[PDB]
Ligand binder design. Structure first.
Ligand SMILES: [Cl-]
Ligand SMILES: [Cl-]
Ligand SMILES: [Cl-]
Ligand SMILES: [Cl-]
Lengths: 597, 598
């Protein structure tokens, strides 16, 4: 259970972000127990931020292993009358958290929150908070790191021996690590408090019924009230226990680009918590993706959390800039490729009416780009257990978001190979079991020669395809790209279920131009997209287009990465390429609902 | 006036109120209709802290004239009422009205320095609204100055036209970024006895390092002070002490440029607890030398701006750290807070990192003639800024007095200091700065390039002459031989005065990616040749003790025919990428020591 920490009449909220001490592990930090004392001979690092790009050091950017963050934590003893909690919104990839040299918690998974109470007895007059952060990835982590597998995107013409041991990402984006999202101290009443809130809605005529389950610790009485934005109470139930329901007459529905959030206020004993909440329905019916019973057409992007110089770190001005650009362009949606995004972004999307495909950290689950899904004993991928935990934690965090309409279980896994169905079926079953709203589930399909053998066909409610007709195949032959595109997409269209692009694009360096089709130029990016839409616009089961990518982003180094991935419609500093203007024109003429009715 | 930086302590809560706020442009009725009394209706959302101008894609918002309203809910525990509850605004640009529920709590003028107000506990209901109205308007009474009838010298048209809407008329180059620029926080102290200010100075005579302290308090209680090394070893302490005293620091390590050392000075008063980082060092001007720890310093660095995309002037902690890392990579040791006080987070980071700072007021644009003279009597049209200028000096020194990194106060940038009345305007301000700084640091004003440079009143006022000169850009453009000759003729006059002088600005607009082997303005090669030409002169002058370029990085400005999407004089681009000249300076500054160059 991970409610977003907020300031309330029963809950303090103390941000610990700022300038922290920082030290690379030299192989002796745990042996010499650096967490027991002030870090010596240390640097300074902003928190929240990825650490890789803050300095000018390749040894720091390309570090392998642990680093140690630390700050002083001097708090009033009178907080000891309350329950005291340290919340880590995200520490990438793995964390060990120490207060005064006592290990308080550990966490695996770099993109979801975790928390620990501080035992009263540990809090001295002066305290040290130390966070050790591990950046290493392998066959057991999500995202996956290679072990003996070859570098496909960053391969040399002639092999060489690396100077130092390094991570081997099985994914494109740069392995930004550190204290990615805010660290905060918060409090709740000690004896009785709210641990979780679950809300589902049903629309009977113009009356919404909101079913609630309020999970609590301790013995007290539970109450719930639903308020309009302007502050009018529209439903209230007292002494309701855990489960109940209530109704809102003439409810205002949350719609894409037309958001409406009620405020759901909960009391339990002395505890107070307010959750914003939008009322909307999601259903797949035939080849339609229905939001509030209307056939939606996705217009948008796969994104990354990527800005300079914080890397993956929470950047709230850029989040607001990015949503503004989305509305400027006529987009209505994006996918959280390839990890859960910050709660601050997710809550902002609820407020702004941006639809979200919420995706796990499960990218790189692919050992043949020994079978990927062989038994662990025979060398198969070792991620399924953690994959289950990620699904649990992602849905627990994001279940109440109106903006989340579909779960993406994995990106570009080896879904055309033997054992893939056996790996994924329990994960799809888990997502359907745990999501109270029973939203659609998908996996994001890698381009593959044997596409009819993609186990997505047996599992997903929507088929989500990553396809690069005119880039990774048919480059500079867009007539051949159109023919190859049509041949495959007519197969998917024949299945009668909704399908969409979750990735399609062409690397494009701003400022490169040619009137005559030429890879990496701004004009070719436009022609690539025109060619694909010639096909997709004729297919009635094709219900959405999300480009790769919203913006240029950092990646590992190699011969096909021109200082990162250049498939953005915008540059890394959010400037529009020619194709950004193309999509503004195109999306201006396509309705959010009823394009393919 | 006293403004200790808010920190989390054993006696003090610190609750950051930054985040997503509601935001509404005023339409002329916001105060008449009392928008602050209810939830903002039909509002937008805006991140705090940030400038509001670049977050959306709206020219009407970017170029808005007048007021905007920010608002958020403020639901806090009633048990905080056993403490003193304070709302701290680190900066609201330019002027602010702060309401809790329907009640005006405070008003502030001055967009770049903090202000705070206690929240009366009777005002705190079960649910509260916090509304902040923010005014962006500038004129002859604000710092920075807005033009009234004066014409646009950097953005003039060939043919006059009537603007569609009334707009601000900046009398300064940089863009008029406004909004809640820096964090808003709630903090608490004990009610009955608390620390209001701490003043520390250093004494280094007789081979003995001592810290002198003055602790200002409210209420009645006992005072204690201890000084601690980085590793937490107490090196001096006393309990039940006076408000003023001194502590000897045995084995004292001095704060040095690029070799910082900060002690932790821990103070208690009653139940209140506060910790101040502090670097021990001396600053003095003697003859033609700028002495830090009695050694002859050479400034290497930049005039900066607080400018990043998309937050504008807003606090950007990752980029602050990036910028310091780039300065150290380049071999710089210093910068100037052009043209306004910077965030406390930046200043405290400079103390931690060993970056020397020239700390400048908001007084840019004090110039009505770039016929009424700038410093004519107010009643005949002269500039109306002197009263606020005094307040800014008091507030700046009160905020930054304890920083080792601050070695000089800059009283104003490019004022009309060659005109009649300038000395009379500035003498009380130099006197005030010298009276109020407990460390009595050097004072300067930053000198506009002017034909009659020998009449610059800086000569009668300043401890260091700080010159903005553009030999090879705004004069002698594409004639660097003439630039060298003109530069030498004037800088030999300054050298003949025998006092320390330096460049605080010099540079050439440079669009990254434009090149020519043959001297051509706006190319990366010309930027290098411009600097080579200037250094041919400055390296021969024994009283020239510092070079700060204009600018660290490209930054946003008002629109016009000589601003190629902002000011392009950065050594780095706005996204902090090095131009050819940034590599030139890395090589040059690598060969110039911080001490003993001249
Ligand atoms: Cl990627
Ligand atoms: Cl790609
Ligand atoms: Cl400027
Ligand atoms: Cl300039």
């Amino acid at each position: 259970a991970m409610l977003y920490p907020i300031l309330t009449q029963s809950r303090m909220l103390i941000d610990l972000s700022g300038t922290w001490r920082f030290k690379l592990d030299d192989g002796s930090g745990f042996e010499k127990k650096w967490y027991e004392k002030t870090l010596d001979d240390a640097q300074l690092m902003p928190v929240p931020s990825s650490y890789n790009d803050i300095k000018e050091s390749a040894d720091l950017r390309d570090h392998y292993g642990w680093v140690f963050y630390q700050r002083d934590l001097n708090i009033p003893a009178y907080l000891k009358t309350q329950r005291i909690v340290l919340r880590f919104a995200a520490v990438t990839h793995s964390a060990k958290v120490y207060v005064n040299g006592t290990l308080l918690c550990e966490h695996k998974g770099g993109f979801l929150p975790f928390e620990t109470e501080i035992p009263e007895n540990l809090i001295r007059d002066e305290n040290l908070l130390t966070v050790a952060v591990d950046n290493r990835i392998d066959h057991s982590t999500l995202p996956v790191g290679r072990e003996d597998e070859s570098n496909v995107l960053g391969g040399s013409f002639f092999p060489y021996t690396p100077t130092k041991k390094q991570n081997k990402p099985n994914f494109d984006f740069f392995n930004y690590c550190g204290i990615t999202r805010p660290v905060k101290l918060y409090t709740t009443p000690k004896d009785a408090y709210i641990s979780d809130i679950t809300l589902t809605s049903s629309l009977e005529n113009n009356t919404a019924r909101i079913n609630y389950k309020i999970d609590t610790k301790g013995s007290a009485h539970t109450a719930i009230g639903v308020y309009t934005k302007q502050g009018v109470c529209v439903a209230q139930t007292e002494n309701t226990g855990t489960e109940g329901s209530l109704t809102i007459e003439n409810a205002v529905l949350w719609e894409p680009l037309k958001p409406y959030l009620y405020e759901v206020k909960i009391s339990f004993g002395e505890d107070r918590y307010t959750l914003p909440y939008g009322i909307r329905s999601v259903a797949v019916k035939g080849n339609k993706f229905l939001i509030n019973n209307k056939p939606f057409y996705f217009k948008g992007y796969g994104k990354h959390e990527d800005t300079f110089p914080a890397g993956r770190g929470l950047n709230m001005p850029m989040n607001a800039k990015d949503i503004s650009l989305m509305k400027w362009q006529g987009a209505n949606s994006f996918r959280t490729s390839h990890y859960p995004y910050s709660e601050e972004m997710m809550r902002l999307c609820d407020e702004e009416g941006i639809v979200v495909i919420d995706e796990t950290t499960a990218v790189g689950v692919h050992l043949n780009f020994v079978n990927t899904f062989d038994p662990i004993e025979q060398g198969g991928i070792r991620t399924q257990s953690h994959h289950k935990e990620v699904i649990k934690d992602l849905i627990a965090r994001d279940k109440n978001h109106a903006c989340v309409v579909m779960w993406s279980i994995a990106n570009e896994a080896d879904t055309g190979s033997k054992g893939a169905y056996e790996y994924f079926k329990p994960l799809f079953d888990l997502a359907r079991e745990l999501d109270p709203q029973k939203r659609p589930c998908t996996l994001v399909s890698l381009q593959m020669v044997n596409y009819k053998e993609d186990c997505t066909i047996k599992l997903s409610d929507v088929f989500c395809l990553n396809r690069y007709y005119g880039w990774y195949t048919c480059g500079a032959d867009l007539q051949a790209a159109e023919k190859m595109c049509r041949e495959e997409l007519e197969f998917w269209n024949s299945l009668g279920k909704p399908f969409m692009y979750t990735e399609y694009g062409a690397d494009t360096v701003m400022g490169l131009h040619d009137t005559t089709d030429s890879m990496f130029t701004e004009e070719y990016q436009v022609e690539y997209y025109k060619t694909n839409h010639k096909v997709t616009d004729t297919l009635d089961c094709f219900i959405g287009e999300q480009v790769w990518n919203f913006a240029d982003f950092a990646t590992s180094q190699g011969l096909i990465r021109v200082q990162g991935n250049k498939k953005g419609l915008f540059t890394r500093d959010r400037k529009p390429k020619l194709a950004a203007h193309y999509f503004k024109e195109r999306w201006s003429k396509i309705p959010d609902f009823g394009y393919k009715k």
